[PDB]
Amino acid sequence: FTTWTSIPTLAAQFPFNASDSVGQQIKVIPVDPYFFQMTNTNPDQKCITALASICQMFCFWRGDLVFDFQVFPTKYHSGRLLFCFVPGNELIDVTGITLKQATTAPCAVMDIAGVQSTLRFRVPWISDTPYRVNRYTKEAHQKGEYTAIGKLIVYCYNRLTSPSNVAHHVRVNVYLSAINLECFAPLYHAMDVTTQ
Amino acid sequence: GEKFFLIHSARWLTTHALFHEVAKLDVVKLLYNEQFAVQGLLRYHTYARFGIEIQ
């Protein structure tokens, strides 16, 4: 089953506007293989990823998730993003973290316009338990059992400078694969769109 | 301790004249703040001796 899980497939889609302030949190991502939010209109469908199709058929997962951020600028936009990883779980009050406080956590910057387009953000396995449970079968929360190993924040590091005859925003795709993935204890479950 | 931290964000305009000072910042005082991970090493020690890498 590593034939499907090691394929980077699209999970998210967010714009980087020119009308946002420095330090504003653009998007927050829960760090688990069960995350996807894309959908289609005709036909009515909920676009699964190749990693969330294999991992939904197990109880416990473990490994290093690899996020891939592909930008679509021209040669004339100019800006930076800050990709921060706050270790923890999928329920922490994370919106109070300022831009200067986010550099305490392990992070990485990215210059947008250049000859390369993709930054690969391999998240290390940080946990207190050796494995992490598929809790989405249940319907109530419980302190101690979780699905994620933290949340990933995207900041506006430098503003987006551009001329007048280009568009005033840059869109970023988010891909999702896994290295050193280990799953066991099978079940059946059909996932759902994380509406965030 | 040895990890890049964002310390300042300025913006360069067409109205700033020649030799105008876009950023004037103390480097070591801005790294001595609670929001960075290096504070947990510097809050409890007294003296230090260090080199600086700027980007």
């Epitope: 302030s21 009050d93 994370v94 919106t95 300022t98 965030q196 | -």
Partner: antibody, heavy 121, light 107 residues
């Protein structure tokens, strides 16, 4: 474009209780903390509440602590301000605002239209 | 527990002159923000941390100062600026705003 639309508000006798409700829009409601700011025509302004992403952490100043209660519903994208034990100091204009991050501190980008509360008998 | 006092309360201005207002604190404050309130509406995105202009604002407004004294400087006055300008802190708990400086067009 962010569109915050307040609702509720009117005439309450001093001693009654009323619940306000702001309403969110296109941009993501969980990524930001919200607030309530008070406009009197004589003096201004005074901030009264802020609740974070989840409904866990709430913050209040010295005056309205114990009287007011802020809440969220993250599926309905609405705010709620539960005001109890009203008096003559609460006849003013109430805005819902969105608190956002800067490099070192916080800042309110987008405010609502504002509803009017008149507390007198 | 900490008070922001704006030293001009009402100011008149001719179109094309230099306009400067002040928001003084009572202790050391790191950053002070600004808001513009035109008559009949709500305040807007005006000036974040100290000198950081917002997006849609004109490029002839300024901000400076540190510690106690802080200022908002207008290079060339126009007719689109007849409004009220509040200041705000974020250091300690009460988050006290400024009293308000009303800028009106001199005729």
């Amino acid at each position: 474009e962010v569109k915050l639309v307040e609702s509720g508000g009117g005439l309450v006798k001093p001693g009654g209780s009323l619940k306000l409700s702001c309403a969110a829009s296109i941009h993501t409601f969980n990524c930001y903390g919200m607030s309530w700011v008070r406009q009197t025509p004589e003096k201004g302004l005074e901030w009264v509440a802020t609740i974070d992403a989840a409904s866990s952490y709430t913050y209040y100043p010295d005056s309205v602590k114990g009287r007011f209660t802020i809440s969220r519903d993250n599926a309905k994208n609405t705010l709620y301000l539960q005001m109890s034990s009203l008096r003559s100091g609460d006849t003013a204009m109430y805005y819902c605002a969105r608190r956002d991050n800067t490099t070192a501190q916080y800042y309110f980008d987008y405010w609502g239209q504002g509803t009017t509360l008149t507390v007198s008998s | 527990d900490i008070v922001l006092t704006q030293s001009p309360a009402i100011m008149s201005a001719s179109p094309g002159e230099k306009v400067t207002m002040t928001c003084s604190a009572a202790s050391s404050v790191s950053y002070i923000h600004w808001y513009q309130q035109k008559s009949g509406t709500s305040p807007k995105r005006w000036i974040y941390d100290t000198s950081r202009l917002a997006f849609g604002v004109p490029t002839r407004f300024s901000g400076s100062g540190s510690g106690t004294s802080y200022s908002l400087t207008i290079s060339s006055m126009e007719a689109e600026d007849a409004a009220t300008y509040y200041c705000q802190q974020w250091s300690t708990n009460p988050y006290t705003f400024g009293g308000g400086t009303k800028l009106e067009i001199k005729r």
